[PDB]
Design a protein around this ligand. Structure first.
Ligand SMILES: Nc1ncnc2c1ncn2[C@@H]1O[C@H](C[C@@H](N)CC[C@H](N)C(=O)O)[C@@H](O)[C@H]1O
Ligand SMILES: [Zn+2]
Ligand SMILES: [Zn+2]
Ligand SMILES: [Zn+2]
Ligand SMILES: [Zn+2]
Length: 323
């Protein structure tokens, strides 16, 4: 498939950089031919790669070997419509449930068939598909949308019909989890059911804020389940109206975080850190927004996942030196 071609002397270094940026397509075998290394890579453009690599490279097409199924079967049977949107090969597994990406236009009993296949080939108790928190269409197995998801050693109650939750962000949450220091006071601006907040358990105090009450209900259940009731303070409100202070501030709202930077700088103490999440073709825009608003330094930046062609969800840790 799509591969990143580089001189093999840079092999291990490039592999590591692709893994941290969720770009390594682990379903293929990195292959070495001649003095070149070919790394199977996920959807990405040459321009943004230049912001995470200083060596020369080439993106190319190439057959490579791999490291029942579902993705296997659906891919051929419905390749017709899949090939044109209707159906996606990508799906999410939140705890006990599976959520397919069937942009319905596909018949209903056709949707039940796929869900049924999924239910059959994928260990789960329920299968749904969708259409921000959107309405779900049940397609097989148990019809319960409430489940518990395990990640990074902790547990999270999630009701997929009520709040937004991406299991794909477990890696990014684990990254932050390890940077947290004992004396930190964390402000999780858009907490959902509390994933970053539970992840930041090393801190001495955490403020978990969200405007969705069901989200806050799951948050509370999660604070208890993980035994962090004397650590995490749940807050039902629009974050703009909350007056709290912290040295570590999390902004997990990609599409609109840019509209909340002023509030974030008001919460953050100087010398503190803001973990910003945004959508972009690269890191330039976000850096500029922050550079104009205060004196800061980027400490680490990562591509989190793809959003659409030449569009990605990005993470940047900004150290705020002076406001
Ligand atoms: N003005 C606001 N104040 C507080 N929370 C908000 C506001 N607007 C949206 N939200 C919440 O922002 C959240 C964005 C989600 N990406 C949070 C995900 C969560 N951090 C997780 O790790 O699962 C949603 O749960 C919204 O309910
Ligand atoms: Zn509720
Ligand atoms: Zn207490
Ligand atoms: Zn969101
Ligand atoms: Zn700045």
């Amino acid at each position: 498939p799509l591969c990143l071609k580089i001189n093999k002397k840079h092999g291990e270094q490039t592999r590591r950089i692709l893994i941290e940026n969720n770009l390594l397509n682990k379903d293929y075998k990195i292959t070495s031919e001649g003095n070149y290394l070919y790394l199977p890579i996920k959807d990405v453009d040459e321009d943004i790669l230049k912001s995470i690599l200083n060596i020369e490279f080439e993106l190319v097409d190439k057959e490579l070997e791999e490291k029942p199924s579902f993705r296997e079967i659906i891919s051929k049977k419905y390749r017709k419509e899949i090939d044109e949107g209707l159906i996606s090969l990508s799906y999410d597994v939140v705890g006990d449930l599976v959520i397919l990406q069937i942009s319905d236009e596909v018949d209903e009993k056709i949707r039940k068939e796929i869900g049924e296949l999924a239910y059959k080939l994928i260990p789960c108790k329920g299968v749904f598909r969708r259409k921000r928190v959107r309405e779900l269409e049940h397609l097989a197995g148990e019809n319960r949308t409430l489940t518990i998801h395990k990640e990074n050693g902790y547990r999270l109650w999630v009701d997929i019909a009520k709040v937004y939750f991406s299991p794909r962000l477990g890696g990014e949450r684990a990254r932050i989890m390890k940077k947290v220091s004992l004396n930190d006071v964390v402000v999780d601006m858009f907490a959902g059911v509390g994933p970053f907040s539970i992840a930041c358990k090393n801190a001495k105090k955490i403020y978990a804020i969200d405007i969705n009450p069901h989200a806050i209900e799951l948050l509370k259940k999660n604070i208890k389940l993980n035994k962090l009731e004397h650590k995490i303070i749940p807050i039902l409100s629009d974050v703009r109206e909350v007056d709290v202070k912290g040295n570590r501030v999390i902004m997990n709202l990609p599409k609109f975080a840019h509209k909340f930077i002023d509030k974030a700088l008001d919460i953050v103490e100087e010398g503190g850190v803001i973990h910003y999440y945004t959508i972009g073709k690269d890191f330039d825009k976000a850096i500029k927004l922050f550079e104009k608003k205060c004196d800061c330094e980027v400490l680490e930046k990562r591509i989190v996942k793809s959003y659409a062609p030449r569009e990605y969800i990005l993470a940047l840790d900004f150290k705020i030196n002076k406001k």
